[PDB]
Every structure is written in C-alpha cells, then in structure tokens.
Amino acid sequence: ELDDVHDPLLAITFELTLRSCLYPHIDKQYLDCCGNLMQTLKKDYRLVEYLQAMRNFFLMEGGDTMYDFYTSIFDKIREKETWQNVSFLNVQLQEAVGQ
Amino acid sequence: WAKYSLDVLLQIHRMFLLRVKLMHFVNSLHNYIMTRILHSTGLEFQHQVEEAKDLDQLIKIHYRYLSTIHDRCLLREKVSFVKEAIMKVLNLALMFADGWQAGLGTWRMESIEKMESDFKNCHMFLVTILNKAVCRGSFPHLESLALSLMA
Amino acid sequence: REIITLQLGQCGNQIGFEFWKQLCAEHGISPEGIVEEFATDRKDVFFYQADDEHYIPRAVLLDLEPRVIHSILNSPYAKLYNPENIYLGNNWASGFSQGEKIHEDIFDIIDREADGSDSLEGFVLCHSIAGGTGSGLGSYLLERLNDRYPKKLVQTYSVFPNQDEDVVVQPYNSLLTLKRLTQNADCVVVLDNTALNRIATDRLHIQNPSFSQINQLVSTIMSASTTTLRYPGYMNNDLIGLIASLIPTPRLHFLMTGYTPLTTDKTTVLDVMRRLLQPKNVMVSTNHCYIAILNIIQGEVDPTQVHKSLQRIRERKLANFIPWGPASIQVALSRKSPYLPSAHRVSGLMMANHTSISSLFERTCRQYDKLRKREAFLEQFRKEDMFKDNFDEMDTSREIVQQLIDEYHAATRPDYISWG
Amino acid sequence: FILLKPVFHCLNEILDLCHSFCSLVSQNLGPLDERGAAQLSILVKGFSRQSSLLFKILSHQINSDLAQLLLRLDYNKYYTQ
C-alpha cells in the first residue's frame, strides 16, 4: 500500500524534503526484508548451519569423520588401480557421515 | 596422504634417518597450512558473518574469505616458481614410502644416496624460493614458514 | 580405530583404574557408566557404546595373585568397567611362567574386544617395569601381541621404577623387560617414581604416602597425552599420526613427559612454553640433546599468538639439541573440556625424545652388572633355574640394552647416518 | 533383477535344466545309464558354464548383490575353476 502510505504522510522549497518522507518506507521495507532473508535462511533453511557444515566434517576441516573416510581409501588391500568405484566411495561417505 | 603415508611407513639404519629428515618437513608444512591459514581465517569469517546484515554483502564477505584462503594456501599466482617445489619434494616422499614395505632387510636399494641428494638439493631450492619472497611477494604468509629451521 | 588398554599387574591396574575414572569424570559419564544428564567429544575411540548409553571402556584388566583387583571390584565404578574380562610371584620368570599357562584364555579375551570393536589400531599397556607379577607377564604378552597382530602397534605407559634403590631382583627384572620392550614394542612413554616423588615434595608436603598421591600425577599425564585423540582437532586425529612425530627411529622409542602447571590446582602461550622447557616441570629424574619435542596446549589460547610464541621460543633458546633429526618443536592445540574446573585456564603438556633417559637405563644396567658380578641375587629358586638354567637371556638382554645405550650416544654424535 | 533381460533369461534356464535333472533322478531308484548318463554329463558341464557366467556378471553395485558373491567365494569354487 505504498501509494496509500505516501499520500497520508503527504497530507500533513520543501519539495525535496517532501520526497524525503517517502524514502523511509523503502528503508523500513528493506529493514524488514534484510531480516527476512537472513532469518529465513537461518531459522527455516539454516544458513549458518549449512555453512558450518561446509566447514566442519566436510571439505575444510576433516575432524574424525574424514579420518575414518580417508584411511579406508588409502588402504592398499583390495584396492583397484585408481579405486574410483563411485558406489564404494559413496558407501564409505555414508559410513563416515557421523551426524 | 603424504603425512599418513610416511606414518604407514614404520643403509638399513640410514633409511630410518632419512624417514626423519623427511617427516619434519612435511609435518611443518601441514602445521602451517592446516592451522595458521585455514583455521585462523575461518574464525574471523565465522564471527563476522554474524555482524553482516545484507544479502549482497554476505556474498561479498564470503567471496573475500574464499579469495583469501585460496591465496594464502599456495594455489594461485606463481605456480612453477613455488608450488612445483613442494609437489616434487612430496613426490619424493611418496616414492620413498611406495618403494618400501614393513618387515625385512634385503631391500637391495642403492638409490638411497640419489634420493638423499635429491631431497637435500630440492630442499635447498625450496628454502631459497621462500627466501626470495623478502624482496617481493606475500611476506606475512611466506616468511612465517620460511623459518622452517633449515637443516 | 578404537584403542584397547591392556592393564596388568597390581600397579598397572591401579593406574588404569585411576585413568578410566579420570576419563569418566572428564567425559559425560557417571560411575554407573550412564550418559550424564548435565552433558562434542570423540568418545568412540576409548569408550565402547552400549545401546542404553552405557559407555564401557575397552579395558582388559589382568590379575595375577589378585589382592588389589578385589578392591577394584568393590568400587562404585565396577558397573562402569564391565566387559566381564577379568581372569585369575615377585620374580620376572615366575610372572612369565604363570602367564604362559593362561595365555590362551587371556588372548581369547583380547580377541573378543578386538572383534566387538568396529576396528582396532592399538594396544596401550599400563605396564609396570620390575613389577613382580606385572613384569614377566607383560613381557610375554608383549611378545605375543606383535606376532598375532603384525600390522598393529603397541604403546607402553611404562612406570619405570626408581625409588632411590623392597625387591632385591629389580635390576634383573627390569633388564629382561627392557629387552622385550626394545625389540617388541612400537612406543614407550617412560615415567619415574623418584622424579614424581620429587615433584610431590615440591608441590606438596606428602612424603610417606607417595604411591597413592603419585597415581593422580600419572593419571594427569596419561589423560593429557590422549586428549587430542579424545577430542577432534585440525591435527593429530589419530594415535599413529601423533606417534610418528615423537619416535624418529624405531629403537629410540622412549618418551619424556612434562606438564606446565604441575600445580594445575591468564597465562600466555609464550609463558607456558618457557615454563615447560625448564627442568622442574620435567617429570623425569659429554653433550646431551633432544631428538624431537612436541607440545600440546589445552585452554583459552589465542590463535595468532601461537606462531609468534614458537618464534619467541626459538629466540629464547632453552631446549638445546643438535640431533641427527631436524625435528625441534611444533605448537599443537587441544580443547579443554567442560564441567570440570578450568583453574589455570591455559595448561600444557609435552612429549619428547631425549637422550638423557640413557642415563636412567644405564643406572639399572649398572646395578645389574654389580649384582651380576657379586652373583648375590640369582634367586636360583627352582622356578628361576628350571625356566632359565643357562641364565643367558640376562646376557642377551645386557647386550641388547648396551646396543640401546650406544645407539642413544651415537644419536648424540653427528654421524648417526652411519649405523648406530 | 527381473527388469534386466539377460540375468532373468539365464537364471530361468538354470532352474529349468534343474527341473529336467530332477525328473531324470525321479524316474528310478536303480542306476540309469540309459542315455541319462550322457545328458547328465552334458548337464553338469552346462550348469557349470552358466553358473560361472552369472558369477562373472555378479563379480548399481547394490550391497545385497555384491555381498551375495562372497557366500560362493567362501570356497572360491567357480572362480578357481
């Protein structure tokens, strides 16, 4: 109802200042929406958790899960030349999900 | 893989010495990359994204954090000058552990002196490459590891 | 892979008991083994997981002529440690012989735990050198495990006995144990009774009840030495990965201990390092040198200052060492746990390879040599004589330990490139 | 595995040749060499052939299918041959 909010505040050489009472509506809308993005992406589709996952027990930080994953792939017994069997790799990852 | 391979690993006594002359170097590189660069940087990223309040700035800060880890780890800019040295002295470790297995004496390895000289001179090249950073380059990131204790 | 602790002998069982009790209090575990209600840690490796959150450690408690194992049983933590794996002289030969007859059943007890675990990396022995029943049996079992598990590794938290020199056969017993340990043990962490007693006099007035109180000091060392495994980290997420740094050559696998706040009952990393390298904090009693040193710090540690601290220690130059190995020192970090007191917020420990321990080995070799010439205590009990008529495994141990002493001093020499 | 034609169309004949053998043994308790021996030797060789063929095929890589191999690999019986 942005036009029906501009007009009320209008109804109470100050022309630039008249326009200056129409920008705080955009500022409030963005202030609620910047919230909306970050809160939505942290309470509903958790962004801090998705990123802290992307760091820990994943590519950045091994932890112990990635130790359990890595030793199996290093092991020379029953190892194919490049050991690129995707089903085996995926199975090892699900064994080492640990969460 | 390199540290674990030299871990999986363990003239006949001189091999035991060369193991040690190698593990120090690889473990020190691992120490720098694993903690000094990635952990410390990830901590201010974790803290600062709390303060950040924008969808676009949250992208910008994330891109800065990735552009700084990817640079502080020796993986951009000069590659033949720096990276291949660490790669080849890693490759020597990989051969050194690939050509050995646990529990016998008769390895019949006469290349031990060749690999000694190789590791020694490539190490000389590595430390001199890092010392060249004094004139130009990322001195905070390099002069921290250039103090590798040499010998 | 999960670690199994093979606590044996009266003293070894006492220290394993205290160590598992310490890790009960430290972790979210009660004396009944149930998860704590008040309770982020890697409890997989050391504690087996029951269905009802009964966290039973993988402890193998071996008793011979049991006296203190009954006291272990009548304790609140008896339900905590229930794998139900306890199976019934002061001489090394007597202990070895007694172990041989029951070797199959105790080894079946070993097998069961190795099997119940998802996987197995290591056997950690709470071994007692010259421990009467503990020694001999521990040497025999040490000889068995490497054969049955060639790929696997054995660590020994040997409490090397120095009590200012009662048992009259201590040098003989310790001599044979060290031979078995030198050739059949992947790692050893050496501790000293006189050294810990001296620290006891230092920090407290306790003199007469040394053993009871020194148990706590030993337990602190044992727990702190494993904390980086028990709690995940950026580095040293496995026993062997840590061990590689500490043991540079297979023969020289005996490790020095140290702890910054011996009176652990804010300090910067610079401060704790320069405190730690001092000899008072060390817990053990011609040029001499370290081979390699490692330090782990657990507390409120600033990250940016740790590398600057290592630089500062390099300038500060306390640790004097010119070994054949380049390894000097690396600063490592572990997490201080919650729920326990955080007194001395920053608190640290060090594991090292030092040539000084050759002196302590040579002291018991000196006692043994004198005793051997006097021939005062051959024991010559019918057990001792029948088991060893030749009495030549003593000489084999003497030459093996003499090789070890010479190897230590050769490590001090600039030319360990040649055979040591 | 009914979806894929080859495995289905070979396990079916594995079962059908066994039906025929079951009939042959069912015929008499007295020994039968009255051409039964000829087709029986043919049968054992043919069944070994197709059984080893499907062994080679077994060895999406689902856990059930790949794990089923080691029951027979216990003896290594068909691979060793």
Description:
The structure is cut from a larger assembly and holds 2 copies of chain A, 1 copy of chain C (420 residues) and 1 copy of chain D (81 residues). Chain A has helices at residues 3-10, 15-20, 23-44, 47-55, 65-74, 86-95. Chain A has 99 residues and is mainly alpha-helical. The radius of gyration of chain A is 27 Å and the shape is rod-shaped. Chain C is an alpha/beta fold and 420 residues long. Chain C has 14 helices and 13 strands. A 9-stranded mixed beta sheet of chain C has the order 4-1-5-6-8-10-13-11-12, sandwiched between helices. A two-stranded antiparallel sheet of chain C has the order 2-3. Chain D is mainly alpha-helical and 81 residues long. Chain D is elongated. The chains are: A mainly alpha (99), C alpha/beta (420), D mainly alpha (81). Chains in contact: A-B, A-C, A-D, B-C. Chains A and B meet through helix 3, helix 4 and helix 5 of A and helix 1 and helix 2 of B.
Number of strands of chain D: 0
SS elements, strand count of chain A: 0
What's the SSE pattern of chain A?
A: HHHHHH
**Major sheet attributes of chain A:** none
Family (chain B): Belongs to the TUBGCP family.
Subcellular location (chain B): Cytoplasm, Cytoskeleton, Microtubule organizing center, Centrosome
Protein name (chain B): Gamma-tubulin complex component 5
Organism (chain B): Homo sapiens (Human)
